Amino acid sequence: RTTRDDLINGNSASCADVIFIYARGSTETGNLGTLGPSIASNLESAFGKDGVWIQGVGGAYRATLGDNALPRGTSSAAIREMLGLFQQANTKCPDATLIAGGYCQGAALAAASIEDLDSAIRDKIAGTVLFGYTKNLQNRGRIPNYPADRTKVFCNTGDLVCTGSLIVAAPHLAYGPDARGPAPEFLIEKVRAVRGS
Template identity: 35%
Template sequence: MKVVGAIVLATAVSALPQGSWNVDTCPDNILIVARGSIEQGNTGTVIGGPLCAGLKKKYGAKFGCQGVGTADGYPAAVGDNSKPKGTCDECISGTIKMFGKMHTKCPKANLMFMGYSQGGAIMSSAIPQLAPDVKSKVIGGVLFGSTRQTISGLTKDQFASYCGSEDSICNRVAKSGSTGSHLAYSKNGDVEKAVAFLSSKIDAAGK
């Protein structure tokens, strides 16, 4: 993500209400969320909140959502976008630890992931580094406006990546400064597509 674009995003989302989801019990399916830069809470409200709510509405007690917050090692700082991996090493290691924590807490649960903006860069680095027993429980994931579009070791049918044609943060050929597109995923139908995609993974797993 370009730092200038990240600053614009920060201004746009800083006034949004806090969004936090935590897994308290052990549902059959857990979505781990890495929010976008400067989003509040541990899931944020631009994508994380609506996506978690959509899956919770469909699966009820069989679904849980867990964000990776500042206390977990991911502060969602704007400046981390300019680092070589598009985020900080601590952000990545904190996310890896969260996957391990959820697997230890709920070893029978299916795991999924969502990364938005800088959170997408985190997932692109974190997923390949998961311990084998944890990675074997990952049934799918989604990225939104991600500053990294690929995940080593995963095929295109294992995760979906949504990047608007006018979103200059994830699309290098988009018009510069079109940050509005970067905030539009919960309004343009892509969150609903992501709910359907992850639902297909949950249903295929039989939980």
């Protein structure tokens, strides 16, 4: 439901083929918030329960609203937490294909983490989905150092955070359809394009 720690809890001797690491939006609960569970259920349907590990970014990521204003759109402590989960995935399951996602502050966190990542781990993230990406205008719809074809950004018309502001208006809360359909569709297509483990 809103908390999933499959990578932290998972046995190294029985690694999943696909590991999904997801960062929630500001003030959301658990470590998956409102959109993460929808994506996770569809990934489990596609790869099976034992085929995919879903891992939310918890720990030091507090998803505090005011941290949207910081230079990278989140705190340094939160970036260190998500970087540590990508490193744990890489160590515990070296042959797994990774996929990532984030909503609002969590999309800025996913972009900042992926930019800072060691290139050999970054290159294993087959696809990343970003909803209500707060650095969309500033980064021109991209994640620094990461290919455009592996990125999909969902930014609604009238969601002001996509156009350089930090005002929260009603379109910002309307990503439920995307999380149920096109975002898991893109992630599954990018994993099958390369394959799994």
